[PDB]
């Protein structure tokens, strides 16, 4: 089919994987070692996150996401201004502003050490908003390194009704996942440079790499579902539209995380592996496209872990920009996705 041919073109070359994985490893492992020399970052450890480690990276292995996490014992959080996702947190004294541990102070020292420690490896110009320090290896491979505080405490109350996976992955899996740590990354609330942001990237990876109702989903030829193929196609649809419309400000604020989040909700809506049969790829992809269009139309895209954090709030994305993306995605759906050609 046309969609199968798209998926074929989006496959990663084994040779590119071998080269890129080796280059990323050498840089990451080196910075890990060097940060451990600093009194503040002694305890950093690696967590691999994002689409490469979820096996949904498309086209080229040219962008990798990692967390350098630090266990902070005795963490005490205070939710910032009913935002549900942003928190105050109360060798680390250098980062205290009062009794709060300043996210911006920690991020600035983290960035400064990496910049000094960095194979042709450069640091990309600071992007506002992002919690990451971003590197570029050999002019081609981007690496986002996100500092994170690790907490082994119970997840914050704003997550109590999130992760609605009980009919898909099971109640016992939901309980096991909520016994894992959670993370705080230095992305600040709109106003607040002291605040941190909840992150569950590690749980997103666990879900995508163990994604079936059947434990043997995608382990044999009889159970090769099309979940990851549908996420890849949604990602490519948004990627291509953002490229075509790169000079149109209306597409600036959309990201692959909006389609990842919508995808997780469609998995909740369609929990059975038989709703993701390979033979139904076009229908499954359409289910994902129509769900995303409904999210745009209703201005509703809840964070999968934090339901009262709406990614499609008018506070974050103007109605006009969602309507613009609706228009372009409807055109694609109505014309058999010419942007894929
Ligand atoms: N807005 C967000 N809210 C929460 N977590 C986010 C957000 N944006 C990115 N992340 C996390 O950071 C990871 C890497 O971000 P990004 O590199 O932008 O996306 P990806 O999932 O890696 N897809 P891509 O790199 O586009 O193939 C995502 O997988 C999420 O786990
Ligand atoms: C092309 O890649 C960009 C990317 O990877 N990011 C930029 C935007 C963003 N926003 C985040 C939030 Cl809100 C949380 Cl909780 C955790 C991680 C992120 C990230 C990452 C570092
Ligand atoms: Mg990525
Ligand atoms: Mg990234
Ligand atoms: Zn599967």
Curated annotation (Swiss-Prot):
Binds 1 Mg(2+) ion per subunit. Is also active with Mn(2+). Mn(2+)-activated enzyme forms an inverted pppGp(2'-5')A intermediate, suggesting a non-canonical but accelerated 2',3'-cGAMP cyclization without substrate flip-over. Mn(2+) ions are coordinated by triphosphate moiety of the inverted substrate, independent of the catalytic triad residues. Undergoes a liquid-like phase transition after binding to DNA, which is dependent on zinc. Its main location: nucleus. Changing residue 130 to A: Enhanced stimulation of interferon production. Does not affect chromosome localization. Its EC number is 2.7.7.86. The modification 5-glutamyl glutamate is found at residue 139. Zn(2+) binds at residues 211, 217-218, 225. Its cofactor is Mg(2+); Mn(2+); Zn(2+). The modification Phosphotyrosine is found at residue 53. The keyword DNA-binding applies. Changing residue 333 to A: Reduced interaction with the SPSB3 component of the ECS(SPSB3) complex. The enzyme activity is strongly increased by double-stranded DNA (dsDNA), but not by single-stranded DNA or RNA. DNA-binding induces the formation of liquid-like droplets in which CGAS is activated. Liquid-like droplets also create a selective environment that restricts entry of negative regulators, such as TREX1 or BANF1/BAF, allowing sensing of DNA. A number of mechanisms exist to restrict its activity toward self-DNA. The modification (Microbial infection) Deamidated glutamine is found at residues 272, 275. The modification N6-acetyllysine is found at residues 205, 213, 215, 235. Changing residue 51 to D: Phospho-mimetic mutant; decreased nucleotidyltransferase activity. Changing residue 84 to E: Does not affect interaction with nucleosomes. GTP binds at residues 49, 144, 197-204. The modification N6-methyllysine is found at residue 327. Changing residue 53 to A: Strongly reduced tyrosine phosphorylation. This is Cyclic GMP-AMP synthase. It comes from Homo sapiens (Human).
């Amino acid at each position: 089919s046309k969609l199968r041919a798209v998926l074929e073109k989006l496959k990663l070359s084994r040779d590119d994987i071998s080269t890129a994985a080796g280059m990323v490893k050498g840089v990451v492992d080196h910075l890990l070692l060097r940060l451990k020399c600093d009194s503040a970052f002694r305890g950093v450890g690696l967590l691999n996150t994002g689409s490469y480690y979820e096996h949904v990276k498309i086209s080229a292995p040219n962008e990798f996401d990692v967390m350098f996490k630090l266990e902070v014992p005795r963490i005490q959080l205070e939710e910032y201004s009913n935002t549900r996702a942003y928190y105050f947190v109360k060798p680390l004294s250098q980062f205290l502003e009062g009794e709060i541990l300043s996210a911006s102070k920690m991020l600035s020292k983290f960035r400064k050490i990496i910049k000094e420690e960095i194979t042709d490896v450069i640091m990309k110009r600071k992007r506002g908003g992002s919690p990451a320090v971003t590197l570029l290896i050999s002019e081609k491979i981007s690496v986002d390194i996100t500092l994170a505080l690790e907490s082994k405490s119970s997840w914050p109350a704003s997550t109590q009704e999130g992760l609605r996976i009980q009919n898909w992955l099971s109640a016992k899996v939901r309980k096991q996942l909520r016994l894992k740590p959670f993370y705080l990354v230095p992305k600040h609330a709109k106003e607040q440079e002291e605040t941190w942001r909840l992150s569950f990237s590690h749980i997103e990876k666990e879900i995508l790499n163990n994604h079936g109702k059947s434990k043997t989903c995608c382990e044999n030829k009889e159970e090769k579902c099309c979940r990851k193929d549908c996420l890849k196609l949604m990602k490519y649809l948004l990627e291509q539209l953002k490229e075509r419309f790169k000079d149109e400000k209306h597409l600036d604020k959309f990201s692959s995380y909006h389609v990842k989040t919508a995808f997780f909700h469609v998995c909740t809506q369609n929990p059975q592996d038989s709703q993701w049969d390979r033979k139904d790829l076009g229908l499954c992809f359409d289910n994902c496209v129509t769900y995303f269009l409904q999210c745009l139309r209703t201005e509703k895209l809840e964070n999968y872990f934090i339901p009262e954090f709406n990614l499609f709030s008018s506070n974050l994305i103007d109605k006009r920009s969602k309507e613009f993306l609706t228009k372009q995605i409807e055109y694609e759906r109505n014309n058999e996705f010419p942007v894929f050609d």
